[PDB]
């Protein structure tokens, strides 16, 4: 039993600390309601993911018996969900609420938090059918109430509820739930909760191919300005992919890059790869070459390899390399649900090559164009070369009769007005950040004006004495 | 912080032996995947008979 | 000043990075490892190729030697505290650090050297301590450590002349700039120390000139060579002992382009094997080629690539293929007409590049400032 | 995409789809957001059998597009058909707007109540009173007094 | 009761907008 | 009843009031600093006219919280000490201040150069270490 | 194929359909192809005889181009077709840029002095 004894020390140490931790959190929720301002609620909620994996069956068992001291229905059904710890010789009376507090019914906020915990622990427990049932009880209750502080906690409960169905692989069943919730979220409430809902309702559309009706919701529904800087990261990504599939590339790149910089740095490493993967594909379609810095990061080296090799063929005008790169890694493109965007790169592989070929040569034989671009024939080279001229890919015209593509000497770009346009873009935003910087400057000043230099009584007393002697 | 577990985190499986550990001005011109330069030159003289 | 032997690094590199060099280094490398009682480097020494199963017996007697020595200094340390002290105590700790640095891992050495720094009251020795931190830092390419003590050494050199140390510092800094792909700094620093090379510990003079000539041409322009490496008295004499390198330098100036490539191929293969240059061996060959092309195209206006196919190395399709890639890259101002087989030069003013990069430089800084903003205030 | 069948010029066939939309006017309303305004076109149509049930759908769709002014306008078009089930989480959203619009209309009228005043819609007026009586029938008197003052009646 | 609150706050909001014009009006004068 | 048109408008006003109040304090705190700055600069003219303070050296502390100081080109004086300054800090030779006419120690100014250090500055025996020792 | 200029394949696929003749749609593509091809050739090229454009796509010597030329330009001459494109008189002007630039700089002044 030596091995069991060693495990007992670790288990006992962990549960005691967290149990005290839950008590600290609950007081914050009571504090937030006590002060009538919902800001405190986030203080316990933020740590919720960190403490998510720091709870055991023993931890939860006391909580249900501890916080819900009143003989509520919870003990009727909550106990069977969670395995009861065996009779322990070292038993202590753990009552978070004493006297009137224990008898007094738990507030909705504390009620939401605790129930939020049991589902969370169950999720780590892999039990789903049970989680959904409990989730339904927790979710059904918070809809009936209309407390202002409950919205913040409800937001989290809103999210994890969908996750429960995710492992349940239902999705469709929960869609109407969010749509209705966003229905009440906009009007009955006004913010801080529909941000989480919008991402969730948006997510279900992406999980399937339901892009057609997904774009409808974005165009109509708006998003709160106060999105906690965490929900905003998801909103940009999903909205980035929606525009990505519909040829709205220009805003696709800007939306994602904004999501990238607003995305958490230290954690959320899993979704950094997915956001990066789509951005490099969206950039490639646009034509701009993605930066090489993020193909060398420790957490992106392996993931981006199937996409780094792609950028090797796209950057080089040759088309055969792209085809030879597709057959090698086509499967992983299937696996990541992005192959749809790659099969449309064949046009870009020609546009880039024709751009460089027309940039480096001045009068190249029409047949020679096909060989360098692996066009497979000279007859069709004219059209794409001809077509490339219309869109503005290259400038100079072609000699149909002779059979050579000529290029115009495009020099002295500085005189043109384009450099001023490029400077306006940088100038406008650079002058923007300074305005924002002053925005946070007027917050810090708070009760910092009453600061006497040396003193008040000492100066006054000395002056009066000197004046009397000055006269005589 | 509020880490996102919904998006799977791909396994790192990285080379922790400091393969490169170099900070340069790396551009995209360093990976043309060409077979060195001596080889191309070496076959050049023989290909043209010189 | 050879305790942080840099030559060991070269043997390690030749053994590890080039997968096709595993035959001759087996002889020289082993003797050094056993000699001097190197144990920590040995632990990682076998971690590259394979376990080398028959190795425990050889180091069975070697490990015990280390323990006796360290206790010897520890015993001497107690005597040092209870004896003359001051100078005696400082040498004792320095003696310990030198062995620890010369034996194995930094951590004991780095903590040891830092401890002795405070007790050393002579500025001259402080440079000795810091200079060691450059050697072991350069050994393992520890940019974080190297990038710091270099400023530390420079600050110390300001107080008191120590011009000899400053000249020594230039070579050490020069090596760093050559490990990193910053040749321009290395050429300026190395050329200043060509006439003053007291750092025989690494890169004996014969190799120092080759490095100064290998980076001089990729760094500076033609008028600068005329009075820095060609007319230079110090460098021209050393090349007499080196036939291969001398023909490489003068080929570019003499415009014998055919011999240039044959000389650039050998430097190509030698740079890969050589440590501190393999990381950017590909960059050197490609960059030198562009430097050669622009040299030839500058004079004329409408030379034919058929003429280039002979005076710049054999091949008409190679010059066509090679030239095309470089024009697209944005360098090598020239523009090719295939049907008539003629390349016509152009003269882009020194503003398009200047503007094209002031926006690209600005973007890099601008992105950095943006990322700082999001870091603060959530 | 079931609303697809709204152009066959078949008066009985058209209405069958409109019946279905209301039950699915929340799960996937988005598709019928702006690409389909034919609900109003049919609500002006002389075909009858409609002009009050389309208004139910017509106002419901505009409910979450946010244009409460449009939602209020069509909502009254259903008349007794719309607010009959006065017990729900939707009736209160429009009614809360009917009082909102009326109060902004009654006040503007008080400036020039001696003729040449705006023709306050009769149907809206009845709705607020019907809500007003629901206050009295609920016996809650405190709320009743204020709404009288706000309405300027 | 409730009417004593809806119309009691209405005054407060129409008040905070008056201090937004005096404070932002003295700034243009204090700075001068 | 009607607690859905009446508890909804009340809440909407509550939100529109908190943000405006939040914006206000950020706006009147800014003005408060500017008002103070004008006040400070307006009192400087009336402040940069009180007679300056003599600078002296306290040779030795005395009893009853009284010190004996020697003023710059002038005779010695026994002067009282302002209560803001503890007599314990008043030490042998150091630099102090006197008010203008009712001399009283105001502040312990930066310490004067030690007389020995002056000797080491006139005489300039160069600093040397064992490293620059030869043979 | 339509996204790029590769069109010789489009007619090759026009004769290879998986479901059926599908001609109810290929007729629609004809409007989306010929109009595009003519537009591309409209650039500042030189004369093109009525021998390439005639036997290029599917037809040998029809009258469609005659109608095609009539509704498009391609002035008829001595077997000489012209396609002139200058786009030079309109550019090289700053008076219109003057009004746009003036508004731009003022905004820099606007957002540099007044408090937001």
Short mmCIF file of C-alpha atoms in Angstrom, two decimals, chain A residues 319 346-347 350-351 379-380 382-384 386-387 389-391 395 397-401 404 417 420-421 423-425 427-428 431-432 435 439 442, chain G residues 1-9 36-37 39-41 43-48 52 56-57 87 94 97 100-101 104-105 108 111-112 115-116:
data_model
loop_
_atom_site.label_atom_id
_atom_site.label_comp_id
_atom_site.label_asym_id
_atom_site.label_seq_id
_atom_site.Cartn_x
_atom_site.Cartn_y
_atom_site.Cartn_z
CA UNK A 319 2.56 25.11 -63.04
CA UNK A 346 -3.96 27.18 -60.58
CA UNK A 347 -4.81 30.61 -61.96
CA UNK A 350 0.14 31.38 -63.97
CA UNK A 351 -0.46 35.01 -63.00
CA UNK A 379 -2.02 27.89 -79.09
CA UNK A 380 -3.59 28.46 -75.67
CA UNK A 382 -1.97 33.53 -76.44
CA UNK A 383 -5.34 33.66 -74.68
CA UNK A 384 -4.02 33.55 -71.12
CA UNK A 386 -3.97 37.96 -73.88
CA UNK A 387 -6.30 37.60 -70.90
CA UNK A 389 -3.29 41.84 -70.22
CA UNK A 390 -6.92 42.82 -69.58
CA UNK A 391 -6.84 42.44 -65.80
CA UNK A 395 1.24 46.00 -69.44
CA UNK A 397 0.86 44.35 -75.95
CA UNK A 398 1.48 41.38 -78.26
CA UNK A 399 2.21 40.89 -81.96
CA UNK A 400 -0.32 38.33 -83.18
CA UNK A 401 1.24 37.93 -86.63
CA UNK A 404 6.25 37.37 -79.76
CA UNK A 417 1.02 59.50 -57.65
CA UNK A 420 1.64 59.35 -52.18
CA UNK A 421 -1.24 56.89 -51.92
CA UNK A 423 2.14 57.10 -47.74
CA UNK A 424 -1.45 58.14 -47.00
CA UNK A 425 -2.29 54.62 -45.82
CA UNK A 427 0.14 58.15 -42.37
CA UNK A 428 -3.56 57.73 -41.63
CA UNK A 431 -1.68 59.22 -36.82
CA UNK A 432 -4.50 56.96 -35.63
CA UNK A 435 -5.07 59.44 -30.97
CA UNK A 439 -7.36 57.81 -25.19
CA UNK A 442 -6.90 60.37 -19.42
CA UNK G 1 -10.51 27.48 -67.47
CA UNK G 2 -12.73 30.55 -67.68
CA UNK G 3 -10.93 32.13 -64.71
CA UNK G 4 -7.71 32.08 -66.73
CA UNK G 5 -7.38 32.67 -70.44
CA UNK G 6 -7.27 28.97 -71.33
CA UNK G 7 -10.18 28.67 -73.75
CA UNK G 8 -9.11 26.05 -76.30
CA UNK G 9 -9.92 23.61 -73.51
CA UNK G 36 -14.81 38.39 -73.47
CA UNK G 37 -12.54 37.32 -76.33
CA UNK G 39 -12.80 42.62 -75.34
CA UNK G 40 -9.33 41.18 -74.80
CA UNK G 41 -8.35 41.69 -78.45
CA UNK G 43 -6.27 46.45 -76.76
CA UNK G 44 -3.71 48.54 -78.64
CA UNK G 45 -2.68 45.74 -81.00
CA UNK G 46 -1.92 46.04 -84.69
CA UNK G 47 -3.84 44.77 -87.71
CA UNK G 48 -5.24 41.24 -87.62
CA UNK G 52 -7.04 34.05 -87.85
CA UNK G 56 -10.02 30.15 -84.78
CA UNK G 57 -12.88 29.01 -82.58
CA UNK G 87 -5.38 56.09 -72.42
CA UNK G 94 -3.41 67.04 -61.15
CA UNK G 97 -6.10 65.48 -57.96
CA UNK G 100 -8.74 65.35 -53.68
CA UNK G 101 -5.29 66.17 -52.30
CA UNK G 104 -6.58 64.78 -47.74
CA UNK G 105 -4.01 67.11 -46.21
CA UNK G 108 -4.12 65.40 -41.49
CA UNK G 111 -6.75 65.03 -36.86
CA UNK G 112 -3.50 66.62 -35.71
CA UNK G 115 -9.15 67.00 -29.72
CA UNK G 116 -11.15 63.88 -30.60
#
